[model samples]
Target: ASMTDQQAEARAFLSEEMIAEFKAAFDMFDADGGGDISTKELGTVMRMLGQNPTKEELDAIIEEVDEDGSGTIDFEEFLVMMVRQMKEDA
Candidate 1:
């Protein structure tokens, strides 16, 4: 019904172990541990994952999921992005 319910549903699709793994991955990207992933940090992460994204591309990606418009990807946004990707893979 509401967005919170939708988020809860999405999270319910993932197991506790998967959530923990996602948290670890998110923390790794958070670099400075400021509780979010900036464009530069995300670019570094993409490189490590074998994909080199341009600054513009990275900005677009973050802008898409940065719900609060904080100009960064927080854990919730990252998790939602991951869930969407995994759903596509499935």
Candidate 2:
């Protein structure tokens, strides 16, 4: 239901810097200003992460995090994925 210990710590590693970036990024991706990221808007995020992900990759990623199955990623979901990915790399 939450990030693993390592993931949480890695997220903490960002502190204010990560918070600032995530807020900014979320605002940018929330296309309709609807408080969630649609498939189209999320492509920008993936590209920004240096990932030229295919449609399938993007779809899979979104499906993993779209807990409500709205076919989008909310801020909380986005946060979890970012922290986990960073933790994995660490």
Candidate 3:
């Protein structure tokens, strides 16, 4: 990431607006707000993010985060995973 981009990214994503984008992203992935993400929901989000996860790869990601075969990612799990993934790309 360029210095400017990093600075921009680091700046709180909320000012005169949301308190935090983290919850927004989580809710988006949750889609129906049911607190559970079906495989369908996950695929939709990954696609929107321009990720083409093969079924196998996608399953692996779910398994890594789900921890109990639950399809939905809780906020805490999502936050940690998101930070790692985005920071790695950065």
Candidate 4:
């Protein structure tokens, strides 16, 4: 027996509530609404969460994920990629 494609996709995706929570977190990072995220801005998020990331660590992460290379992330890229990082790490 094999699962349908929809079933497989559903299993991999976040639930609605999880998506909403992720959106709120994204908004918190997207302070300028310029449709991108920068290393420095992400550092602010770490601060707000009472955590501190080393500069090298943050920059490496930003380079890994920022598809636009605009020093920020658009919602499209952010939604598909950025949200998964937290889930995977968790």
Candidate 5:
């Protein structure tokens, strides 16, 4: 399956409430309403979440989740990353 298929499956694994919560977080970080979160916005978001990530870390994160290589993370990518994080944390 492709990344889209995987993302859809991950979305189904999450509850509607959880999706809403993730959306809220995504929107909070997507400050420009550009439909994607850029590296700078991601840095701000991470800081607010109480982590001080270095530029390299931020670049790595974007490289990890920016599936389309758009240099940004859209909602689908964000949700997929969150789902993976949840799984790993468990």
Candidate 6:
């Protein structure tokens, strides 16, 4: 069997501080103790980050990290995406 995206990215995470920061970001969206974020919550985050993507675009982003085909993002998934993004921009 193969490791999942979250597994690989969790392994690749190089700094405790960064991991904590990313985890905090995900937790901010995962309101009400749901342990995951809906597309609408993600959209809010994106807008707060200054990227006003359309519905299609938001869905596309969720598809990238929405493992388990749940159509929502969990903390591990968010961590992976954030780590990958940092690597790409560096």
- TM per prediction: 0.64, 0.52, 0.50, 0.47, 0.66, 0.59
Clashes counted in candidate 4 amount to 4
Top of the candidates by TM-score: 5
> How many Å off is the CA of 51 in candidate 4?
5.8
Candidates 4 and 5 compared: the better one by lDDT is 5
On TM-score, the stronger of 1 and 4 is: 1
What would the per-residue lDDT of candidate 2 be over residues 28-63, giving only the tens digit for each residue?
776646677768777776677776768877688777
Error of 1 at 9 (Å): 2.4
Candidate topping lDDT: 5
Return whichever of 1 and 3 wins on TM-score: 1
Could you give candidate 4's per-residue lDDT for residues 1-88 as a string of tens digits?
1223323344357666756676656676657554456776776765666766677766776666564456555444555553444655
Candidate lDDT scores, in order, read 0.69, 0.67, 0.57, 0.57, 0.73, 0.66
lDDT string for model 3 (7-69, tens) is 344344334243365556567776767655556677677667676767765576677666556
The candidate with the higher TM-score, 2 or 4, is 2
Q: Candidate 4, which segments miss by more than 4 Å at Cα?
A: 1-25, 50-53, 82-90
When summed lDDT is taken over every stretch of 10 residues in candidate 4, the lowest stretch is 1-10
lDDT of 5 by residue, 1-90 (tens): 557776887878877787777666667777856667778787777777677678877788887767576677778667777676574554
Candidate 1 TM-score over all chains jointly = 0.64
Error of 3 at 80 (Å): 1.3
Better of 1 and 2 by TM-score: 1
- Comparing 5 and 6 by lDDT, which wins? 5
For model 5, where is the 10-residue window of minimal lDDT?
Answer: 81-90
Q: Candidate 2: which stretches are off by over 4 Å?
A: 1-21, 44-57, 87-90
lDDT of 1 by residue, 52-88 (tens): 6677877887766665556686776567666665645
Task: Compute the lDDT for candidate 2.
Answer: 0.67
Which candidate, 1 or 4, would have the higher lDDT against the true structure?
A: 1
